[PDB]
Amino acid sequence: HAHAPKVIVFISGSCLFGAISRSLFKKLPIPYTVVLLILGAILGVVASNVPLVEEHTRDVAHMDPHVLLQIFLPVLIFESAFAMDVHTFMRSFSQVCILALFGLVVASVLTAVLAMNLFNYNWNFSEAMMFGAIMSATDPVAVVALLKDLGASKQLGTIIEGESLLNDGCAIVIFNVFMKMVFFPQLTSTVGQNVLYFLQVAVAGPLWGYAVAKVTVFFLSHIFNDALVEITITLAATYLTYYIGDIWLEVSGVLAVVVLGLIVNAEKTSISPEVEVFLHRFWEMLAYLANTLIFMMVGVVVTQKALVAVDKMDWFYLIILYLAITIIRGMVISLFSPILSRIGYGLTWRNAVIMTWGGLRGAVGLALALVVENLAGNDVIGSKFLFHTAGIVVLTLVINATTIQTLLRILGMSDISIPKRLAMAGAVRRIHEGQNRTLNMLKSDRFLADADWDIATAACEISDPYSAREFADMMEEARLRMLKAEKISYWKQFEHGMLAREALRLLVQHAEVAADEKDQFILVDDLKKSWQIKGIYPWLKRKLEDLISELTKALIPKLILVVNGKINNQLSLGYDVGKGYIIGEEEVGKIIDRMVDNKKILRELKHISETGRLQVVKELGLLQREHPGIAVSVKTRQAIRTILNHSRETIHELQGAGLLDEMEAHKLELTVEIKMKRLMNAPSSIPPP
Amino acid sequence: HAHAPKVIVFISGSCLFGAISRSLFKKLPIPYTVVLLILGAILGVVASNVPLVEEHTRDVAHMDPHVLLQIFLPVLIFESAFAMDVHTFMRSFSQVCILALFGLVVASVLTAVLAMNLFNYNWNFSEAMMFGAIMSATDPVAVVALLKDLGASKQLGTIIEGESLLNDGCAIVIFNVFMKMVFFPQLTSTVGQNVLYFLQVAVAGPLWGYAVAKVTVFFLSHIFNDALVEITITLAATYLTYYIGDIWLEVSGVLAVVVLGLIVNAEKTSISPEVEVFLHRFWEMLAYLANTLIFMMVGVVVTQKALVAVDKMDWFYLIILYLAITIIRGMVISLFSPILSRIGYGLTWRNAVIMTWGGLRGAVGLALALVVENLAGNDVIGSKFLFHTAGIVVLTLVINATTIQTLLRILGMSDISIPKRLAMAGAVRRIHEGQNRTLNMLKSDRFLADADWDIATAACEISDPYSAREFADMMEEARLRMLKAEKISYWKQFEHGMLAREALRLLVQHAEVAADEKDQFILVDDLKKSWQIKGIYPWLKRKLEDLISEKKIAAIPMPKYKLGKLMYKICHHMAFEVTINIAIVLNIVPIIMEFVVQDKSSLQKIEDALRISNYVFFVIYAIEAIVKILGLGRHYIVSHWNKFDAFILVVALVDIIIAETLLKGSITINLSSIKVVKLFRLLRGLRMLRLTKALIPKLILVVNGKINNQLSLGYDVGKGYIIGEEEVGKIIDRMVDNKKILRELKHISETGRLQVVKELGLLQREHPGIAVSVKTRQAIRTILNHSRETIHELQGAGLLDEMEAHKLELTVEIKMKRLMNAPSSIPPPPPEN
């Protein structure tokens, strides 16, 4: 038949409307999403009258809700899940869980009882909770995207995403639970059925996701030098996870997707060094396309069906709703602030204001409102939901995303550190004399003595981006000097092929956490790296439980082996962190004295470094003697890494010098890459000779 | 409504299966596509037996053909076109075109003739051409990978890619043309209709593709620091191009996609490197997915529907068919071997055998066969087509791919040159020396002391993968030594940022062309590099023609009466010309409206609106003319180019006077515009023709830019040659043993160097504009490169955090991109400075 894929013209054409908006409106503070919404609203009026609504451009007007809930939401969730930094997230998971779960529950309940008590169109309990779960899903991408470069503590930058991802994940679960109670009546059930439902939606999801993630990460480490297989495996795995977990067996697919994304992101080492860049870009492109599509459908739908039945009463109600939701978020944050402060980091009074004002609603709420509107057929439900959600989203995008910069400048954390200013000044001045030296060298050239030097001034250089008691002074400068004077050492050794990978981050975070702290020498060894060396946890208690419990009987030895491996991993990591700390402080011990002018603090620093050394020096041997295999295993695994690194730079030196061609060097580099990848998957412990 | 979007899971499973093959049968010489076909054949029967699997495979068993034809084919063709090497393909464009066109036409004709009678099938001639066009589509990817493994000639790979790409592109169009008239006849209308069909399927599509490619390249050239935007505009451009080409406006279709892909691939400079790398990976992934899916449906369909009723003789026919498709194609090459030898690179009988045995069918033919079978309704069409196509594809993949491995070693191109083997042996020996030196360093560590040293054997190094009258020898070995010295010098000049890339690739391919020649050095630039210095294209001649077209008096006589010069300034200001051009552009729409009305209460308005608009435009033109001409007098009549704007006004006045009454007098009721009013309207379309005065300089500057770019490339090539010659003269001076070898080589080098330096000096003297710009560009680009190196050194030294380093980095790349699109011409400085 002459039938054609009518959906191609719209979904692609909409993309173009994004491309103009992103490039043209990037300078203005206002995001392009509101422009996309206005474009969709304008297109809706034209579509209403003219016969331009063919089977295309009109199918989206009555777009099927199940497939959009089944396609858009999983990719929207998984992109943010993949973009996460899992390592820093584990350090505050405990705080984030209590900031997310209870916060979402309380916020949804309060903003539901508000609409139950305020609005005239009477709604029961279920509809109110569906409304609240729709209006309690945030999207603070811009806040972090603009706060990361400001130099603020990365803890806030990761905590914002940690709370937002969990909020979005649980909002869909609550919405789905409370949707079938009103839209799809299925008689009644006893308490046992409810218990089974709760267990299957809360426990089965993450477990299924974890199992699939483990299977795919085990199957991914066995494939060598083939990017296509990795990409195809990941793409098939995520879709299979969601589809099987949601359709064939009734489990929460989105939670399984979240767990799979987090687990895969944690194991990025097994991924090829170049595949993950392509994967990140591809997922980000999908998320951008989905956001553009969702905004345009909202824009076209709202102007025709969602506006016929409104009155000034509702337009007044909208302001009260906005005030209520921002107030509720503020009260939740303030009430939970003492508990957060008591447990670990917490937050100051400054960060709470930004947390409250930094919550921008996103496409998730709009998609849920569209689904609600599509399912319903009357005006009491499906007209208030979409109109209210669109109004709240537009208000937030207009106000908060515009005033966040002024709020930051007022709070004073937008200030640039003076050490950063002087570092930038020195760097630009030295790049200047380097450019001058290069120009001087090019000046005495037989051929290049004729080029006009006006274009040399035109190239110029990147200027400075910023432009614009007797004892308490030298000790602070000494402290901020030693912290990075020791920080540099980890990178210097690692670039030589040292400290594996995890040790670098593990010790740089320990070095920087005490930097913001006042009047305490960093790297105190008080359970900082002692925790990894000890390896104290009930893992061995679980192994003891297995032992007292003990082919089915032969399964227990397999559990014993996996427990042994998981112990040896932590033992090896402790060995690496101890070795790295010792190696770094050995250099800084001779480094410090050259800049330190005052002797009475220089000797204090030397003594405290000696104290930091000898304890960990003894502890390393204490860990070595009990389990001799781990030390020889880690030393052996490090030697091959160093040797392969040296092979790598001699190959690159020959290639750069021109003595080798391109294809032979590429083949040898591929071979050494394969050898190092084979090195990465190695037995945890090697018995001593 | 989407209670179960079951269309997903199967396709995902398909990819899994393919992945498994690529991980399990990698060592096997047979490609994984045979394994995929076996898997599909196995799965088909179990799908038929089990109702649930039949439900899951119902869509595949009933894939509608229209979407398959217009989804997989565009992405496949665009992926094949994108990974192309545009330059080497352009160096043999004529050869590739003639070979592809003639070979495809001849093969299709002979195959149709063969299937006419020998097969004893009840087919007519049109479906015979259908079958011939289906079978003659190839995709030699695996064989090309095999050739590139052992380092076959890059030119051979370029030819075997170009021929295949053009073959598929033309075969798809021929198949569509001879399918539409067969399955859905539209009878006959007019020979002119046939001519219009030929024109719309031949020329329109390439022009549409070129237009969209130019537009998207221009739009992309201005986007800075946005990867997602570039990726999405590229994807949308390709999809919209194919969509508008195939349906709505009716053109060739895939030809437009081919042109767009080639143009985009050639202008990859304006695309940021990460963007093009990501696009390459994405397109090849899509192609792999499409191939996997196509083989999946081929297996399923040949399992359930096809093969049901096949007699014993059909397989016999299959064998015969194979021989045909392995003979005629080869003879075609021979029948064009004497001619193609005279064209470009020529060829050799060994290469003739290679491309004769290197013709492998693939996904395109199977997809077309599947479309035919889906649109079929009986057994003589579709079932036989599927069976024969699958047989030929499987036979080719099994036989040709396996046999060419023996063929290459039995002819002798798989040999490894002993200089390469000795160089690799020395390289791995020195690498092993580095390994043992590192082990010696690290075996005495205060910490890494108890590590077991047996793992050194684990480190090891790759053993050589190859494993296994006196004048002429020193001449040839010395010549090869000079050649390698040259190319390593050029690579050094590049990595230090001194030679760009186009000059490098051109001159190194000249180098290896001289290398394969018999005792021939790079030789003096008689035309090998002198051509790059002489812009002997007709472009400059056309520039002279444009200049004489634009020839006019620099300053018209200055009026003095009444306002005088100010009035002349009114009649010669750029604002007045811009206003006249804008008036012409705005009245062009009235011409379109009048034409639409003539070709056709709605008409009541147009009965007078067109006349009113025409009168207003005529009055505006008369006022503009009154603004000019005054004071010039005879100078107004002297300027014939300017006077050409008065004939349109005279014609408009005559038409207005005639149409005022048309009954009172003048034309009256004679044979005139009274009979047909189009004569009044058609003349009104001439006013838009008085606009080339400002358009000519645009193409003048375009040609100037083209010739300046050619001059810049020539200067870069000369710089590279002279620098490499100096370095080699300073390096080899003591390497050469025989005094006479040194004398001959140094004399040849001296002749070349002191010829090329004088040629470059003459070029600089005659046209100082381009050389200065080239020097400035090279200086600033090397300055930026060294600044980037210093920034990277600072990052390595940890003086700055990595995020500030990245900020300075992308600022440097922004400056570099601003450098790339800078004009290639710089005015000379005044002598005072």
Side-chain angles (χ1 to χ4, degrees), chain B residues 178-283:
Chain B
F178 272 90
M179 158 262 256
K180 272 221 269 280
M181 90 177 31
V182 165
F183 266 33
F184 326 117
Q186 56 224 354
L187 269 310
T188 186
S189 41
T190 303
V191 52
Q193 293 309 282
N194 304 16
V195 164
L196 257 283
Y197 200 24
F198 192 16
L199 255 47
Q200 74 156 136
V201 305
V203 179
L207 297 196
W208 168 239
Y210 174 58
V212 290
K214 270 305 173 204
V215 166
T216 186
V217 157
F218 158 64
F219 261 136
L220 196 144
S221 84
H222 289 29
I223 275 150
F224 284 95
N225 190 17
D226 266 294
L228 317 159
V229 194
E230 293 167 42
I231 295 151
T232 192
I233 170 154
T234 291
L235 258 177
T238 62
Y239 264 134
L240 269 283
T241 280
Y242 183 81
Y243 193 96
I244 297 152
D246 213 330
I247 46 185
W248 297 0
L249 161 65
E250 192 45 87
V251 299
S252 324
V254 287
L255 291 183
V257 156
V258 153
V259 170
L260 157 71
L262 283 177
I263 290 274
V264 157
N265 192 14
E267 278 54 2
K268 72 171 41 67
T269 87
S270 89
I271 274 77
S272 320
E274 54 305 353
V275 165
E276 44 95 356
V277 164
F278 170 85
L279 270 161
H280 283 166
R281 180 80 40 192
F282 171 84
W283 282 117

Side-chain angles (χ1 to χ4, degrees), chain A residues 546-563:
Chain A
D546 312 331
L547 293 184
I548 74 184
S549 321
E550 207 33 73
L551 173 65
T552 67
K553 277 73 59 188
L555 301 193
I556 312 300
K558 197 215 174 182
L559 315 182
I560 297 315
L561 303 179
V562 308
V563 174

Side-chain angles (χ1 to χ4, degrees), chain A residues 361-377:
Chain A
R361 313 297 193 234
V364 168
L366 292 147
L368 302 163
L370 285 180
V371 172
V372 156
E373 171 285 340
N374 185 291
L375 291 199

